[PDB]
Design a protein around this nucleic acid. Structure first.
Lengths: 111, 244, 170, 115, 183, 198
RNA sequence: GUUCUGGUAAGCAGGACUGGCGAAGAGGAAUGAACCUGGCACUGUGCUAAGGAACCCAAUGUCUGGACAGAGACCGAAAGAGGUAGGUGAAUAAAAUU
């Protein structure tokens, strides 16, 4: 079963993170950008080393497309969180989900 | 503005909402505190209401401070109710365990031979049955399942209760072929003693003289007479309004 | 943080250097602009020269040495404005600089009397030996006779959740 | 229990190396001589500093009844000579790390058969 | 703010003391008593044949608690070398009060107070025992713990007074006469 | 992350401070189990706590009490309601989040073996001064009609038995293995397996 | 907002000066015609204001003093004692005290 293999392949090679919010103020949301936390990264200086890296959301139960790709654009705040952009806008139903950080840089056009 | 004169409320709010009882047969829901210092005994029973009559009794009750010399004796007329109480038969037992959510039942164990009157409660319509109810259970005696069951009850329980039914066939005026079943608690001694006392008595008949004696005080639980839908004047006792 | 500056200035009219006097003023402030502000304030109250007739010729910072961070005793004479009037007083402090002494007074009065730093005025700062000390507070620390243990616990790690069997504090 | 008095040895918050207290100012502040190391190329530095007591943890005592700055630098470089920033497994190259991993992993396969 | 506060109590020749945490336990001729000081912020230890309390950098109302702690420890030590006593005396202008001792000196009954026909019953707290005095109107209490002894005596005194009467005409009562250590 | 679980021992933490940290995790998809809810600590005298709770019982719906507030009387359920109101519970996202939480008085038998976490920033001895009073939630709730105190004391005694047995069972294996591995019979086979992997 | 006249006053009646709402959206004071920031065609990337930074809810921590009242963060007078932190001026002193 290909899904079980594709997971183990990704698990061995990537860092792990979770999606927790869109970019927002107290009143309005900006769904083009999403906010991520990475496992053991806990300062803004530590987080700067990931700016530019590729990210992937893998979803095996999906009928349309099994994974969405994206890129980390900027650091956010002072405790090591980041801001990222994806080829499609993330649904509110997909918040709380697991994200993979891929250890190589890509250009803003590739996504 | 405040009302002109004071008066009490009509009826008690301790009984609201006043809805209809679900079935006609009551469970004893609360039992007196156990005491390990006494012998094993039963705490309750079932009875049927017959009717009323009156009696005359002698009395000598007066104030302790009353200065009268003579040992005055006086007749008093009193009304009384008669209840019929045929012997109940024991047919099984249940053990319970204490938890953060109250008492929960662990297992139930039944006698090897059960009566037609008690099996009749398990089906809905009396005259239409294949009667294959408890026919496979007796194997559990041969297999030692019963002996494993008693072990588990004896090992892990806080409260033990017996199951008893009433012999409806002795009271023909009821027009009833299904026995009534009640769960009754055992107080006194330790869990082991309680279980042995029960085991000795499955299938046997306990007379009312085991449980109660003359002059005792007892609590009676029942469902009242029915009166249908009714207006406020009778349901809560409110006054009738002006005639015009 | 607080710094020490010394400002120099002269009078001018429709023509230059109208008096041959030069006036000076030492001040504790956070920056040069707050220093220059104080110079204007004192001139207008002790003399009557308003800014349009003044010129500042120099501002200099004053700095100590103290490479070994040696600890010294200081006494300070001050006043402050309350709701009633102006209140004068004297207090003693310990530190590694005159500015270290002065920043501790400003913090103290704000804590004890609910006053913003701009309503407090320093009159004198003096360095003292052990025989000069007047009040009770610092004398035990000056005579070198103090030890104490730690009352506050300290965290071992930056992690939010840790295993029950780990060591938690210090 | 230890005490904060001249010659106490302390660690600072989230730090591995020892430092030493030199004078006591008030009931909440002290002057310390502090040791630290640049992981960029083993460049050490020792310097004096004023610190509040809520950032330090005491661990022991030494004399220094009378000493100069250069002497106490000597005391400190001896004291923390053995210590390190990180476990070497994270510093070495990939093949060396794998070689070290194998030792542990094989030892378990022996123990689980021998027990 | 006080820089340093210390208080000390000396352990006599026969006595033995231990400290587990903030519980302090005492043993000696008359028996054993113990008390837990976990509700006070203080450091307690045993050092050179003394019991020592200490604090640093504390407020005025924290040092009052330290001192109070030290006085309680002394009462425990004293009470262990000899117990304490309290003496009670019945007083009456018309109706003689009478006393009964029951349960080996653990229960006291009082009868005929101001002519009342109902009885009163008082129970002894802890180690305490009740005994008859020099004439019929006297009682003595004896025990290890100054707390337990004095609390008991107080409860008797506080209940055995007139109510809804003018106390400067009706002066009857049971009063605490004498208190001290036993010889 | 969805699919991660965590078990928390609630003893010695200040109630309102732990609750904030827990609520953030529930919104990130973690499943949380809290154990020992009867040992959480509140600051101040118990006298003040009693008055704050009396003012709460007075609140009710004027025209129908079966709509009005429900006043919960178990330590587990009380701490549950403290966490509930730090989440967006009027909306679906909060209702989903709440169903990821379980709270127990004592420790149940299915959670004796599992390893347990703690939150150093919220422990009383870090976050409060020593010179002031505090009380436990188990101490307040007996005054407002909790009825299962004794059931929890019996549970607490089973835990102590399991702790001593597991520690005794561990220390023997530690000794056994450490004494074993110094032997030649062990150190020989290291070579015998390495001959086939070098 | 700053000021004035009549009235015990009033979300009361009536004038003067400089900006508003009327005819003004957006972000902030939980909510509010008029208060704070600041004037609007339509898109994209960066930065700041006012106001925030345990959790609801995007971003939070540190240092030094006070304070124990179901207090305060939101909140009433003349009159006062008690507890505690500091200033100044009088004494006395065989630790200090008033």
């Amino acid at each position: 079963m290909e899904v079980i293999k594709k997971i183990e392949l990704k698990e061995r090679v990537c860092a792990k993170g979770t999606l927790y919010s869109h970019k927002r103020s107290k009143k309005n949301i900006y769904p083009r950008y999403s906010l991520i936390t990475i496992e053991n990264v806990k300062t803004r200086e530590a987080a700067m080393k990931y700016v530019g890296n590729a990210v992937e959301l893998f979803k095996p139960e999906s009928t349309k497309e099994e994974s969405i790709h994206g890129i980390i654009k900027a650091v956010h705040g002072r405790s090591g969180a980041v801001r990222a952009k994806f080829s499609r806008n993330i649904s509110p139903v997909e918040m709380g989900s697991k994200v993979y950080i891929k250890l190589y840089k890509m250009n803003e056009d590739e996504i | 503005s405040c009302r002109n004169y004071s008066a009490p409320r009509h009826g008690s709010l301790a009984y609201c909402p006043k809805k209809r009882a679900k079935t006609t047969k009551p469970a004893i829901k609360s039992f007196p505190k156990d005491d390990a210092s006494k012998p094993v005994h039963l705490t309750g029973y079932l009875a049927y209401k017959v009717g009323m009559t009156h009696v005359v009794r002698l009395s000598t009750r007066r104030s302790k401070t009353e200065r009268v010399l003579k040992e005055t004796q006086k007749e008093v007329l009193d009304a009384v109710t008669i209840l019929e109480v045929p012997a109940m038969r024991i047919f099984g037992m249940v053990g319970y365990k204490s938890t953060v959510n109250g008492l929960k039942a662990i297992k139930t164990v039944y006698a090897e031979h059960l009566d037609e009157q008690v099996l009749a409660r398990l089906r809905k319509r009396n005259s239409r049955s294949s009667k294959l109810m408890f026919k496979l259970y007796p194997q559990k005696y041969e297999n030692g399942d019963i002996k494993r069951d008693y072990e588990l009850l004896k090992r892990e329980s806080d409260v033990v209760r017996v199951l008893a039914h009433t012999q409806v066939s002795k009271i023909p005026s009821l027009n009833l072929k299904k026995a009534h079943i009640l769960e009754i608690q055992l107080n006194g001694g330790t869990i082991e003693e309680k279980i042995e006392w029960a085991i000795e008595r499955l299938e046997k008949e306990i007379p009312v003289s085991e449980v109660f004696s003359q002059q005792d005080l007892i609590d009676v639980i029942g469902v009242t007479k029915g009166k249908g839908k009714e207006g406020t004047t009778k349901r809560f006792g409110t006054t009738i309004l002006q005639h015009k | 943080a607080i710094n020490e500056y010394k400002v120099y200035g002269i009078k001018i009219d429709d023509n230059g250097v109208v008096g041959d006097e030069v006036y000076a003023h030492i001040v504790f402030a956070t920056n040069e602009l707050l220093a220059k502000s104080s110079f204007n304030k004192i001139l207008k109250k002790q003399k009557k020269i308003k800014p349009k007739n003044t010129k500042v010729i120099k501002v200099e910072e004053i700095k100590e040495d103290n490479k070994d961070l040696d600890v010294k005793n200081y006494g300070i004479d001050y006043y402050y404005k309350s709701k009633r009037c102006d209140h004068k007083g004297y207090k003693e402090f310990r530190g590694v600089s005159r500015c270290h002494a002065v920043d501790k007074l400003l913090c103290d009065i704000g804590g004890r009397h609910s006053v913003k730093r701009n309503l407090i005025f320093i009159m004198k700062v003096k360095e003292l030996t052990v025989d000069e000390i007047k009040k009770d507070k610092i004398k035990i620390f000056a005579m070198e006779d103090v030890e104490y243990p730690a009352y506050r616990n300290v965290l071992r790690s930056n992690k939010l959740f840790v295993s029950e069997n780990e060591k938690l504090f210090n | 229990m230890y005490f904060i008095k001249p010659g106490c040895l302390i660690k600072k918050k989230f730090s591995i190396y020892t430092s030493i207290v030199i004078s006591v100012i008030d009931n909440n502040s002290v002057v310390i001589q502090s040791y630290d190391k640049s992981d960029n190329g083993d460049v050490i530095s020792i310097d004096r500093e004023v610190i509040n007591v809520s950032k330090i943890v005491p661990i022991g005592n030494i004399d220094i009844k009378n000493k100069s700055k250069k002497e106490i630098d000597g005391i400190l470089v001896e004291e923390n000579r053995n210590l390190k920033n990180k476990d070497d497994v994270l510093l070495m190259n990939d093949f060396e790390r794998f070689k070290e991993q194998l030792k542990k992993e094989v030892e378990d396969m022996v123990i689980e058969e021998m027990a | 703010v006080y820089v340093y506060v210390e208080e000390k109590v000396q352990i006599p020749e026969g006595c033995k003391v231990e400290v587990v945490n903030k519980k302090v336990t005492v043993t000696g001729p008359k028996g054993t008593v113990s008390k837990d000081f976990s509700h006070i912020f203080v450091f307690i230890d045993i050092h050179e044949e003394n019991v020592r309390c200490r604090l640093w950098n504390c407020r005025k109302q924290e040092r009052s608690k330290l001192i109070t702690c030290s006085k309680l420890i002394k009462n425990m030590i004293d009470g262990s070398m000899s117990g304490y006593f309290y003496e009670l005396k019945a007083a009456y202008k018309h109706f003689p009060i009478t006393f009964e001792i029951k349960e080996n000196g653990k229960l006291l009954i009082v009868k005929n107070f101001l002519g009342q026909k109902w009885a009163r019953e008082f129970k002894m707290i802890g180690d305490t025992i009740i005994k008859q005095g020099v004439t019929k109107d006297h009682l003595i209490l004896e025990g290890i713990s100054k707390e337990d002894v004095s609390q008991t005596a107080g409860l008797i005194q506080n209940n055995c007074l007139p109510k809804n009467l003018d106390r400067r005409i009706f002066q009857d009562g049971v009063y605490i006469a004498t208190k001290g250590l036993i010889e | 992350m969805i699919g991660k679980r965590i078990v928390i021992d609630a003893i010695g933490h200040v109630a309102g401070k732990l609750a904030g940290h827990i609520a953030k995790e529930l919104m990130c998809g973690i499943e949380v189990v809290i154990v020992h809810a009867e040992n959480v600590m509140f600051t101040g005298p118990i006298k003040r706590g009693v008055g704050k709770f009396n003012s709460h019982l007075n609140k009710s719906c004027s025209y129908n009490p079966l709509r009005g507030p429900f006043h919960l009387r178990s330590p587990s359920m009380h701490l549950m309601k403290v966490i509930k109101r730090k989440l967006p519970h009027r909306k679906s996202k909060g209702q989903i989040a709440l169903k990821r939480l379980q709270v127990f008085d004592g420790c149940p038998t299915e959670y004796l073996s599992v390893e347990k976490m703690v939150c150093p920033r919220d422990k009383l001895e870090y976050t409060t001064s020593p010179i002031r009073k505090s009380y436990k939630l188990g101490d307040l709730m007996i005054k407002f009609g909790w009825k299962y105190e004794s059931v929890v004391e019996k549970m607490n005694q089973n835990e102590e038995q399991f702790k001593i047995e597991e520690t005794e069972k561990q220390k023997v294996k530690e000794q056994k293995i450490e004494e074993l591995k110094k032997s030649n019979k062990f150190q020989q086979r290291v070579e015998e397996i390495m001959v086939q992997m070098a």
